[PDB]
Amino acid sequence: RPEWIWLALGAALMGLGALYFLVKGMGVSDPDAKKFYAITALVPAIAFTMYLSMLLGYGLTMVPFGGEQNPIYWARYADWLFTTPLLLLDLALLVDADQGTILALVGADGIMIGTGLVGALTKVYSYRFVWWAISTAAMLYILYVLFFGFTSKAESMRPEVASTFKVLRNVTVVLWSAYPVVWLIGSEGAGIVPLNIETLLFMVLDVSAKVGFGLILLRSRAIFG
Ligand SMILES: *C/C=C(C)/C=C/C=C(C)/C=C/C1=C(C)CCCC1(C)C
Ligand SMILES: CCCCCCCC/C=C\CCCCCCCC(=O)O
Ligand SMILES: CCCCCC
Ligand SMILES: CCCCCC
Ligand SMILES: [Kr]
Ligand SMILES: [Kr]
Ligand SMILES: [Kr]
Ligand SMILES: [Kr]
Ligand SMILES: [Kr]
Ligand SMILES: [Kr]
Ligand SMILES: [Kr]
Ligand SMILES: [Kr]
Ligand SMILES: [Kr]
Ligand SMILES: [Kr]
Ligand SMILES: [Kr]
Ligand SMILES: [Kr]
Ligand SMILES: [Kr]
Ligand SMILES: [Kr]
Ligand SMILES: [Kr]
Ligand SMILES: [Kr]
Ligand SMILES: [Kr]
Ligand SMILES: [Kr]
Ligand SMILES: [Kr]
Ligand SMILES: [Kr]
Ligand SMILES: [Kr]
Ligand SMILES: [Kr]
Ligand SMILES: [Kr]
Ligand SMILES: [Kr]
Ligand SMILES: [Kr]
Ligand SMILES: [Kr]
Ligand SMILES: [Kr]
Ligand SMILES: [Kr]
């Protein structure tokens, strides 16, 4: 399986990212700051587990569509189901979002990843893209609440919080927006690029969205109470 190279590198970078965050957090006692270390280290730990599972051949299924048997890594969606809500919780704790907003984001993130997977398992080529469209609408709902709602909340807090939140907000909009496009061009969608290139592109986005995001958050004074 040519994609195995990117599964192995993906596992190695998520694993080292998780260990990095844990070692950096050992120099921290602030209760507020520890909550962000715990969440931010768990995200690449979950991704490490799912990349290792896919590398060893677990979390793969064949879906017939477009008159072919198509390899679909469903473990990718299992990873995203747990990690995308932890990343949204990092942002929600930074701007001290209320519990209702937190539930609405988790729910919307559940629809985004759930309909993602339904589309990936859909046997009628055409309907794959209806589910992609619903998943994308849910992502746009999330990015709207983050970009407009959370910025407004962050601007009513201390400037250190507004400043860190804006950088994390900018990275999230850019990286999250790439995912639906990679799905469209990859083996899950139109099959313009082969599985091994889809895997490489998801791996770069995942490492950027977990380790990159995590470095920006945990280097900031905004996480201290
Ligand atoms: C750690 C990984 C992260 C930040 C993953 C993000 C994943 C997405 C934003 C996925 C979104 C998708 C759509 C909006 C369209 C349909 C397919 C998905 C699931 C790739
Ligand atoms: C600049 C990046 C913004 C990304 C988050 C929003 C994603 C798109 C979702 C729905 C459309 C929102 C309408 C945007 C108009 C701008 C309004 C304003 O700046 O006052
Ligand atoms: C056929 C794979 C189903 C995915 C389980 C969440
Ligand atoms: C699906 C679009 C979400 C934006 C809310 C105004
Ligand atoms: Kr590797
Ligand atoms: Kr550690
Ligand atoms: Kr956590
Ligand atoms: Kr996991
Ligand atoms: Kr895990
Ligand atoms: Kr596994
Ligand atoms: Kr799995
Ligand atoms: Kr799983
Ligand atoms: Kr998982
Ligand atoms: Kr988990
Ligand atoms: Kr969460
Ligand atoms: Kr996020
Ligand atoms: Kr959240
Ligand atoms: Kr909710
Ligand atoms: Kr929910
Ligand atoms: Kr979720
Ligand atoms: Kr899922
Ligand atoms: Kr579409
Ligand atoms: Kr999808
Ligand atoms: Kr960015
Ligand atoms: Kr970015
Ligand atoms: Kr986009
Ligand atoms: Kr998109
Ligand atoms: Kr496409
Ligand atoms: Kr990418
Ligand atoms: Kr990227
Ligand atoms: Kr980043
Ligand atoms: Kr860090």
Residue numbers in the entry: 7 to 231
Provide text from the study.
High pressure atmospheres of argon and krypton were used to produce noble gas derivatives of crystals of three well studied MPs (two different proton pumps and a sodium light-driven ion pump). The structures obtained using X-ray crystallography showed that the vast majority of argon and krypton binding sites were located on the outer hydrophobic surface of the MPs – a surface usually accommodating hydrophobic chains of annular lipids (which are known structural and functional determinants for MPs). Taken together, the results obtained show that, in addition to binding in internal cavities within the MPs, noble gas atoms interact with MP hydrophobic surface at many sites and displace lipid molecules bound to their surfaces. In the experiments described here, we extend our knowledge as to how noble gas atoms bind to MP molecules, showing that they readily interact with the outer hydrophobic surface of MPs by non-specific binding at multiple sites and in particular compete with binding of lipids to the surfaces of the systems studied.
In total, 47, 35, 11 and 19 noble gas atoms were identified as partially occupying positions in the four crystal structures (tmBR-argon, tmBR-krypton, KR2-krypton, MAR-krypton, respectively). A good consistency is observed between argon and krypton binding positions: of 35 noble gas atom positions identified in tmBR-krypton, only two—which have low occupancy (0.1)—do not match corresponding sites in tmBR-argon. Moreover, at many positions (11, 13, 8 and 6, for tmBR-argon, tmBR-krypton, MAR-krypton and KR2-krypton, respectively), noble gas atoms replaced, at least partially, lipid atoms, with an altered conformation of lipid chains being sometimes clearly visible. Native datasets were also collected from crystals of the same batch for tmBR and MAR at ambient pressure. Overall, the derivatised structures do not differ significantly from the native ones with Cα r.m.s.d. value not exceeding 0.3 Å; rare side chain position alteration was observed. This effect was more prominent for both tmBR structures, in the presence of argon and krypton. Inspection of the correspondence between noble gas positions in the crystallographic models and the MD simulations shows that almost all noble gas atoms positions observed in the former have a nearby counterpart peak in the latter.
